[PDB]
Structure 1
Amino acid sequence: SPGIWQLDCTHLEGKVILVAVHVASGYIEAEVIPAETGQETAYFLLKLAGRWPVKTVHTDNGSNFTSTTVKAACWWAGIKQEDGIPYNPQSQGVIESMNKELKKIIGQVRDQAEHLKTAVQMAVFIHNHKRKGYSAGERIVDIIATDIQ
């Protein structure tokens, strides 16, 4: 579970926000892209796995599951590519909630930047620092450190 991430795609202002959630902590990375392609998703995964020890990715849809570019990135970075079927029905609800919370933070910061990408990065910052008392940022670091030991 320290190595499991879930991909998530949401829309705002005619653009796409691509999100990876570290499942055990709720810590997130996110980027704005014009549209979700195999290439964009493969590139995002490569960035993510250079930064965190990514063992498993649950892809956000069947297109990214199927995508040969996505599979090439997962091969490259040593990631086990998995489906994102919520065999646990609570998974749908956790992600739906996260999308709504992210969008609310984006709306709270939206006037502090011209570009959506800036607002989304501000939202990422606030989400990962929010104490719920540990933050998601602290949780992921603790989970991975325990693992290394």
Structure 2
Amino acid sequence: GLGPLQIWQTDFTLEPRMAPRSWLAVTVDTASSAIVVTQHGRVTSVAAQHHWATAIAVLGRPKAIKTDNGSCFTSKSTREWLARWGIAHTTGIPGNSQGQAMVERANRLLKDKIRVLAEGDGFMKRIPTSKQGELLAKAMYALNHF
């Protein structure tokens, strides 16, 4: 009612411990601080849309999504996908310098958690491909659920 606006922040961050699908797409729901992360082999417009399809299934449809000016986010294809869903998109002030410190902070907490969990299982370098999915799901659980 007087509750926070439903605005998300989304960004891509590279994590070589998760190669070959080392591009992690991370969305922070600013109203709840919930985080959703998915893994991708390449940063393309389609990877961003696949990420947000997953995020909408888990968090519901937001009123707006804030991103940086990465081309996977400002292409015609991504713009039409967001219009199809009725979601407003902003890159904020053109040289906002900040504006998405929340997702930036999530990126760092996420990578730290993947490293500590991986090293706890004995993987000091790249995580074996077959173990990556449960390890990413474990890091996401750890940052969301208390």
Residues 1:3 and 2:19 aligned together: no
**For the Cα contact (< 8 Å) 1:5–1:21, is it kept in 2?**
yes
Partner of 1:117: 133
Partner of 1:77: 85
Q: Where is the helix percentage greater, Structure 1 or Structure 2?
A: 1
Q: TM-score, normalised by structure 1?
A: 0.73
- TM-superposed CA distance for 1:33, in Å, is 0.3
Amino acid paired to 1:31: T
- DSSP 3-state at the match of 2:62: coil
Percent identity over paired residues: 26
Amino acid paired to 1:123: A
Deviates more, 1:98-107 or 1:80-89: 80-89
- DSSP 3-state at the match of 2:43: coil
Deviates more, 1:20-29 or 1:51-60: 51-60
Residues 1:62 and 2:74 aligned together: no
Query: Structure 1 residues 30, 60: closer, same or farther in 2, change over 3 A?
Result: farther
Partner of 1:42: 49
Could you list the structure 1 runs, at least 4 aligned residues long, displaced by more than 6 angstroms after superposition. none
RMSD: 2.4
- For 2:99 and 2:63, the matched residues in 1 are separated by 22
Amino acid paired to 2:132: L
- For 1:5 and 1:59, the matched residues in 2 are separated by 9
Aligned residues: 129
- TM-superposed CA distance for 1:84, in Å, is 4.7
Deviates more, 1:16-25 or 1:78-87: 78-87
Unaligned runs of 5+ in 1: 131-149
Q: TM-score, normalised by structure 2?
A: 0.74
Query: Structure 1 residues 42, 90: closer, same or farther in 2, change over 3 A?
Result: closer
- DSSP 3-state at the match of 2:11: strand
The CA deviation string for residues 34-79 of structure 1, in whole angstroms up to 9 with x for no partner, is 1211011112223323441311011233313321221122112111
- For 1:101 and 1:70, the matched residues in 2 are separated by 27
Q: List aligned pairs for 1:126-141, cutoff 5 A.
A: 126-130=142-146
- TM-superposed CA distance for 1:17, in Å, is 0.5
Residues 1:107 and 2:123 aligned together: no
Query: Structure 1 residues 97, 48: closer, same or farther in 2, change over 3 A?
Result: closer
